[PDB]
Design a protein around this ligand. Structure first.
Ligand SMILES: O=C(Nc1cccc(S(=O)(=O)N2CCN(c3ccccn3)CC2)c1)Nc1nccs1
Ligand SMILES: [Zn+2]
Ligand SMILES: [Zn+2]
Lengths: 790, 270, 98
């Protein structure tokens, strides 16, 4: 929102330069994002009167500039003429873009200065009125030659740009902002004149208004002013529109933009003698109704759209765009003025659908102050009198009820102080509400604050708390800490704690913590998933890279390894703990399951000068996963397997308590090769499953005071059998006293040798050679019978 | 190629059942585990953790804890004295007295001091000339024994599980008044009774009570204004209880067969 | 792009109790700011608006680089915005049953 200082001073004076104004407004709630200075880079700009013009062969002009003698100015501009008051940069003068005004000679003829376009004093074409767009500017009325031009133009001015919050629609206007400034500086604000010299007729006899959709149109009024003559607006209207980024059009069209800016009330003008009727009718559009906007585009309506009509026919999209016949033109002489409140959501959706967003429609979206609907109509009627030769009919034709324009809210100072941490008296609080221009009465220890409808943000008394605090000052709010009366020690949950610990142990082993994107390409969303299960796609992805949730962490960890490797980062070691997502079908939240995965390639251990290089292989990758199981006190088993992206003779499934919870494996040589990767290993695990095992306290065993016994057996097997199966019977037969086993060697045509070292021990009772041979030989017999030589 | 890379595939098959290349994990000392557990409980209640000297002045070891020069506690026979006035500390309370005095008489104080302590005794399976204490000390303005009791309850749950209850038995220490000896409900037998708890269903884990007026005042706090509670416990004992460790000396002998049993996380179980 | 991510991270918090004040939110923010950026940090609270809180604030930390001269890091204002906050809104409490 663009607020001119110059202009604002019509309603309130803060007594202060514009920079101090901005700073105090910013401090108290409304951000001034910047300040536009219309005087900038301009020197020696004065009004001239063009006394005579010769064009026997450039345009040579004699210009009164308030000196003794006229100056000759050569000006090539298609619209310059005698009789015109104009803008002159004098010799010695400066204009934006580093332009210098020199004594000169054009085609052998003196020029003492330059007559300017608005663009040439820094105005954007976007907001230059059509009349002067492709030549020079001409003042709409007479001004004394020699007068300061910027001052005459109402552009010797700075303009604050507010970047407002939705809270503060009130500052979408000059009148709102002046109420804010008047509070801040504790000074009087004055609204403008809206009393017109009214005729003997009434609009009651001119016009009917009926509202058909009152759920959707809380109010609609109109007034009539007759015998308007259309011509340029005065220069202060023009310049104020310009400073606010609106192109001036003409006196009548301009009045409605002006009063929009002044009061915040969107106004519409219809040619009275072209409504096509003497009834206005507000209602919904009918499904697949058409209209044509002023615009000459044809607008397919839906029934959610509000139109204005007469009786057969839409004369406008309400609040959004006029139609192609009821509008003001150069020929118009009688006008009807609308002041209506339309439903915010209706307007927001219509303008968005049809890409017909305007400054006026955004006012309807952000909500309208009831206190100013009639007053702002009355203001435009007044201005039309004053600047459009208008004749103002008595009365208003309206439908609907605006409420009360104050809403009382009760509050105590205890509630204020206890919410904020303040110690203000009723006096100081009551004075704040008055400062803000709120009538506030104290009965006992209760203030009734009479909150005017021009602050439509304030409805409940927490709203009124923020006023106090922002006005009195957030700087002044005391620093405390809450004292809780129910005492609890703050700690990580078990799961939270284990997760910190586990990350620590993965970092301790050389793995970097990754964080990958949850969203994958729809093609890859089911990559590495083991249960078939629906994937979850976004209605509106911004990228095909990020269209579908993730049923595995491995696609992006593979990508991430591919990326590092391409950048010559050959040693990649990463882990992630993150959610994957599985559809519970339609309209249902998915299962979000926390995984633990990682990926490894390169050296694990390197010291070149010693000739040390240990390349990551599968058993390193298992070591990582073993180390996760150790730290967590969990028992994992491992059986050969076949998966998706994986080397089929170097992949294993991982089980915990007879549940499969993940896998480890080398990437398929094809997938490696696609990604320019060397030998690479990944693992993926259901962390949710892991975290369900309650492991309790560590089970301590006593330290043996005497030795145990170690025997190494040597087997022969289906070269073809899992070592896991040996370990399992052995350990099934070793009872009380088998402490540990180790496969320490393998050989392989058709059979393999497995050397395994058994460690017997009894920390509890006295171990004997007789029990150890009894058990040993029952071991080697369980082995023989589940199919084992030696 | 779909011959050759295909029979490379097969020359590359492995028993995935074989021993991983271990990436070995070192152990956290059982005594450190208990101390840190207790650190964490009390950090979460707003307390600080304080360390002090292991070799201490007899004023702070004794005098400031309400043991005048007479007192039997100060026997040269039962503490490791280095001079008449300097000795290995017998408890971590010197740290807490040195800390209070520094606060010149303003609260709160809420501190937890773990550390090594020293006693002139012969070593066996239940006695160590060097062992460990954790004490703490709260000094504030309406501090009650109800407040020491709720604190002890959390401690006992922290150590031995959410279901633990405590019992307070009257007792006597010179630095506190009233004093209590504190039992935890046995974490093994529900409350039937067992070897672990000597078939009483209660196990003694802590002592505590209200800081004694003289102790407050020698340190500069005003005992008409400020009360106080304090407490001690012994991780050596706690951890022998919790795990069935058979010999206190096992903590200080560093058999890796003992140490390396304490690699893993624990939980509240079920 | 370099300053915008479709996936990013938040931390929020919420305290609900019986005489909770904005002084209490302020002291909490001060600790947060020190935690993150050092014991010497101060904060600044600027009025603002979020639908779920009332009053609302936007929160700056004193710049941890330039004392408070001004620098690139803090856009030569000496304050950097790090948090928003304010009092939970009545409707939010009540829809949740408090
Ligand atoms: O007051 C304490 N701690 C305290 C309170 C009661 C019980 C125990 S305890 O069980 O571990 N204890 C250890 C010492 N024992 C002693 C020591 C000397 C004499 C008698 N008995 C008794 C048992 C410790 N410290 C303070 N620091 C500063 C101010 S008060
Ligand atoms: Zn028992
Ligand atoms: Zn800075």
């Amino acid at each position: 929102m663009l607020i001119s200082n110059e202009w604002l001073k019509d309603y309130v004076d803060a007594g202060v330069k514009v920079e101090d104004l901005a700073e105090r407004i910013t401090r108290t709630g409304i951000e001034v994002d910047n300040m536009i200075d219309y005087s900038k880079d301009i020197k020696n700009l004065v009004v001239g009167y063009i006394q005579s013009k010769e064009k026997g062969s450039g345009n040579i002009c004699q210009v009164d500039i308030g000196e003794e003698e006229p100056v000759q100015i050569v000006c090539g501009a298609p619209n310059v003429d005698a009789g015109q008051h104009v803008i002159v940069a004098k010799v010695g003068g400066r204009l934006p873009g580093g332009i210098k005004i020199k004594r000169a000679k054009l085609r052998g003829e003196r020029s003492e200065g330059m007559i300017c376009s608005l663009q040439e004093i820094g105005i954007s074409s976007n907001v230059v009125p059509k009349a002067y767009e492709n030549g020079i500017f001409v003042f709409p009325t007479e001004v004394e030659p020699g007068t300061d031009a910027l001052t005459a133009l109402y552009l010797n001015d700075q303009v604050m740009e507010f970047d407002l919050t939705p809270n503060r629609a009130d500052a979408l206007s000059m009148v709102g902002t002046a109420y804010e400034v008047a509070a801040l500086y504790q000074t009087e604000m004055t609204k403008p004149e809206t009393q017109s010299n009214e005729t003997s007729e009434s609009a009651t006899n001119e016009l009917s208004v009926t509202i058909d959709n009152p759920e959707k149109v809380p109010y609609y009024s109109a007034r009539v002013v007759k015998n308007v003559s259309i011509e340029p607006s005065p220069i202060w209207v023009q310049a104020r529109l310009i400073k606010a980024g609106i192109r001036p059009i003409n006196n009548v069209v301009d009045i409605s933009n002006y009063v929009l800016l002044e009061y915040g009330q969107p106004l519409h003008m219809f040619d009275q003698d072209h409504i096509g009727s003497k009834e206005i009718v507000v209602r919904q559009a009918k499904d697949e109704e058409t209209m044509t906007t002023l615009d000459n585009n044809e607008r397919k309506l839906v029934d959610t759209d509000i139109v204005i009509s007469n009786g057969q026919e839409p004369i406008a999209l309400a609040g959004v765009m006029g139609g192609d016949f009821s509008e003001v033109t150069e020929q118009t002489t009688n006008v009807v003025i609308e002041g209506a409140i339309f439903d915010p959501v209706s307007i927001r959706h219509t303008s968005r659908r049809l890409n017909l967003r305007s400054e006026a429609s955004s006012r309807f979206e952000k909500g309208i102050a009831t206190e100013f609907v009639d007053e702002a109509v009355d203001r435009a009627c007044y201005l039309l009198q004053e600047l459009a030769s208008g004749e103002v009919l008595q009365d208003r034709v309206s439908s609907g009820d605006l409420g009360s324009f104050v809403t009382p809210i009760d509050i105590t100072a205890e509630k204020v102080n206890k919410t904020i941490g303040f110690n203000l008296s009723n006096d100081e609080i009551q004075s704040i509400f008055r400062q803000l221009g709120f009538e506030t009465t104290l009965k006992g220890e209760t203030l009734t604050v009479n909150v005017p409808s021009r602050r439509k943000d304030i409805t409940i008394k927490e709203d009124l708390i923020e006023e106090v605090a922002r006005i009195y000052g957030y700087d002044e709010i005391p620093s405390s800490l809450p004292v809780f009366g129910e005492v609890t020690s703050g700690e990580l949950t078990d799961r939270q704690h284990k997760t910190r610990t586990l990350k620590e142990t993965l970092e301790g082993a050389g793995l970097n913590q990754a964080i990958t994107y949850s969203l994958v390409s729809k093609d890859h969303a089911k990559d590495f998933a083991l249960q078939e299960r629906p994937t979850i796609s976004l209605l509106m992805p911004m990228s095909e890279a990020h269209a579908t949730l993730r049923q595995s962490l491995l696609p992006h960890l593979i990508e991430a390894t591919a990326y590092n490797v391409a950048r010559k980062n050959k040693d990649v070691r990463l882990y992630e703990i993150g959610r994957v997502f599985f559809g519970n079908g339609e309209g249902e939240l998915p299962d979000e399951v926390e995984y633990l995965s990682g990926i490894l390639t390169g050296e694990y251990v390197v010291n070149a000068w010693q000739g040390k290089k240990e390349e990551i292989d599968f058993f390193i990758a298992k070591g990582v996963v073993d180390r996760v199981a150790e730290k967590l006190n969990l028992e994992f088993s491992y059986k050969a397997g076949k998966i998706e992206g994986l080397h089929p003779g170097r992949t294993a499934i991982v089980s915990l308590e007879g549940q499969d919870i993940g896998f480890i494996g080398e990437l398929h040589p094809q997938v490696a090769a696609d990604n320019d990767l060397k030998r690479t290993y990944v693992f993926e695990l259901n962390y949710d499953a892991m975290m369900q095992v309650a492991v309790g306290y560590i089970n301590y065993e006593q330290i043996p005071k005497f030795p145990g016994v170690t025997r190494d057996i040597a087997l022969e097997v289906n070269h073809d059998v899992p070592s896991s199966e040996l370990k399992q019977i052995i350990h099934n037969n070793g009872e009380d006293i088998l402490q540990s086993t180790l496969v320490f060697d393998v050989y392989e045509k058709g059979k393999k040798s497995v050397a395994i070292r058994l460690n017997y021990l009894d920390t509890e009772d006295t171990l004997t050679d007789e029990r150890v041979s009894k058990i040993h030989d029952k071991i080697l017999e369980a082995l023989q019978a589940e199919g084992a030589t030696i | 190629l779909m011959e050759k890379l295909n029979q490379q595939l097969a020359e590359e098959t492995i028993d995935v059942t074989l021993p991983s290349r271990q990436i070995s994990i070192g152990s956290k000392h059982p005594l450190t585990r208990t101390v840190e557990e207790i650190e964490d409980l009390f950090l979460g209640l707003g307390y600080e953790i304080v360390d002090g000297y292991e070799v201490e002045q007899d004023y702070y070891n004794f005098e400031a804890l309400n043991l005048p020069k007479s007192h039997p506690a100060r026997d040269m026979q039962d503490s490791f004295y280095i001079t008449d006035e300097i000795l290995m500390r017998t408890h971590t309370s010197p740290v807490q007295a040195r800390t209070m005095e520094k606060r010149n008489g303003q609260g709160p104080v809420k501190i937890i001091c773990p550390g090594k302590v020293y006693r002139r005794d012969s070593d066996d399976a239940t006695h160590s000339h060097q062992f460990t204490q954790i004490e703490g000390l709260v000094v504030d303005k309406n501090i009650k024994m109800s407040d020491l009791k709720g604190t002890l309850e959390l401690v006992a749950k922290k150590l031995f599980g959410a279901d633990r209850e405590i019992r307070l038995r009257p007792s006597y220490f010179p630095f506190t008044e009233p004093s209590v000896e504190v039992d935890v409900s046995c974490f093994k037998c529900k409350g039937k009774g067992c070897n672990v708890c000597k078939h009483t269903g209660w196990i003694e884990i802590l002592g505590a009570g209200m800081v004694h007026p003289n102790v407050l005042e020698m340190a500069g706090f005003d005992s008409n204004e400020y009360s106080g509670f304090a407490f001690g416990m012994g991780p050596d004992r706690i951890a022998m209880l919790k795990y069935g460790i058979e010999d206190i000396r096992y903590f200080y002998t560093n058999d890796v067969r003992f140490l390396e049993q304490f690699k893993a996380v624990e939980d509240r179980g079920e």
